[PDB]
Ligand binder design. Sequence first.
Ligand SMILES: CC1(C)CCC(=O)N1Nc1ncnc2[nH]c3cc(F)ccc3c12
Length: 167
Amino acid sequence: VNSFSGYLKLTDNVYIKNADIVEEAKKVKPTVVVNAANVYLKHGGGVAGALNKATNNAMQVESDDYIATNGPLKVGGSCVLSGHNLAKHCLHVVGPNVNKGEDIQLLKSAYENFNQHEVLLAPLLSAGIFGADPIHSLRVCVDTVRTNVYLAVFDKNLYDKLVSSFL
Ligand SMILES: CC1(C)CCC(=O)N1Nc1ncnc2[nH]c3cc(F)ccc3c12
């Protein structure tokens, strides 16, 4: 038993709540929050920029030191850093960016990083809010992650509808 609430059981190990992942994290303070990051860990906007703003830029400061030491992540890769005031840890995961011509098959590799953690609060990766992409991000998540994943989806229409289209 954990402290997640209003999470609609999607499968044996996948759950979802109509929520902003940043606000979910502040309330729950989970062991692991997933950031939908880029390879440079430049948290300018989206979940990344909003989580970082919620850390008062401490996430960015820590990330810049990580990159200066280790260089960029791989598309499909991840690193574990501090969760600051939002979680014990933040798992920064990079899904393919199709607008950069990056192969979306790498989305499965991205979700495989979740299997190294027993429980995670996560947003949708390589999805966005338009077309069959966000819908696609969920199918790969369900078919790839075996650990317990709590998906926060901020957009209601997508939340409402991913549920209604879920096989
Ligand atoms: C793009 C994608 C990652 C996948 C589908 C989805 O809804 N996304 N965004 C978000 N994901 C998680 N929490 C969120 N909080 C928010 C608060 C806002 F004002 C605006 C957007 C979000 C948001």
